[PDB]
Amino acid sequence: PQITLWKRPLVTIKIGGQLKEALLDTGADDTVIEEMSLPGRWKPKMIGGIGGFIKVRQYDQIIIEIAGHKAIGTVLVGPTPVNIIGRNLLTQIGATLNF
Amino acid sequence: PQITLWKRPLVTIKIGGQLKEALLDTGADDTVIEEMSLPGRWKPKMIGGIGGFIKVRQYDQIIIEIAGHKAIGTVLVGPTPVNIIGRNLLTQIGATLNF
Ligand SMILES: CSC[C@H](NC(=O)COc1cccc2cnccc12)C(=O)N[C@@H](Cc1ccccc1)[C@H](O)C(=O)N1CSC[C@H]1C(=O)NC(C)(C)C
């Protein structure tokens, strides 16, 4: 698809068998999702944004479907205001910005 | 241009006579620039993201040249660590996300 930006670029993701909504976010290096249970061991990470730094849980090699495209990679879990698909997974689906 | 997302999508912008580097950010509703002086009347606003909220000054009808393309819109000024070009100005330069 070709997504214009007059509205937020919200898509449906499937993770852990659940459907969720998430934003395609070119300003985010990483992918961060709201609190949920994921399989496996996690590692600690600090990420920062507009209002400061938050601690999150890093899970690796997680299967996630983004608007119907399968991606496998790192997902962070923490207290984020919105589910964010960042550039680590946007590169896996082949997304580009065009103007 | 077509901009791949292996790296942060940073471009040069010109605002208020000054050249600055800024991030093209499809996750941002608003455009937020580091503290600088701009002409005109402003109103205070709070904006939130990862980490919480910050206070900014809202300037209306500002002209910004984004990688050589002129756009006009609302610009928020305040203590951001990175200059952010959000959807309110990305629309005006005809930016789309494609996959
Ligand atoms: C994975 S979530 C963390 C993400 N941060 C980043 O990828 C990179 O951060 C940084 C890069 C370089 C220097 C930095 C210094 N101090 C803090 C963060 C920094 C982030 O919050 N990115 C956001 C943009 C941004 C990048 C760098 C600094 C600050 C903000 C995001 O694209 C967005 O637009 N979001 C995510 S939450 C809502 C919305 C957002 O903040 N909206 C505004 C800007 C408040 C309107």
Number of individual domains of chain A: 1
**What is the H-and-E element order of chain A?**
EEEEEEEEHE
Tell me the total number of β-strands of chain A: 9
Cα end-to-end separation of chain A: 15 Å
Question: Which CATH class of chain A applies here?
Answer: Mainly Beta
- Contiguous helical run count of chain A: 1
Give the fraction of residues assigned to helices of chain A.
under 10%
Helix/strand-derived class of chain A?
Answer: mainly beta
Name the quaternary structure.
homodimer
Subcellular location (chains A, B): Host endosome, Host multivesicular body; Virion membrane
Main location (chains A, B): host cell
Family (chains A, B): Belongs to the retroviral Pol polyprotein family.
Organism (chains A, B): Human immunodeficiency virus type 1
Give short descriptive properties of this protein.
homodimer; 99 residues; 9 strands; binds the ligand CSC[C@H](NC(=O)COc1cccc2cnccc12)C(=O)N[C@@H](Cc1ccccc1)[C@H](O)C(=O)N1CSC[C@H]1C(=O)NC(C)(C)C; hydrolase/hydrolase inhibitor; HIV-1 protease; acid protease
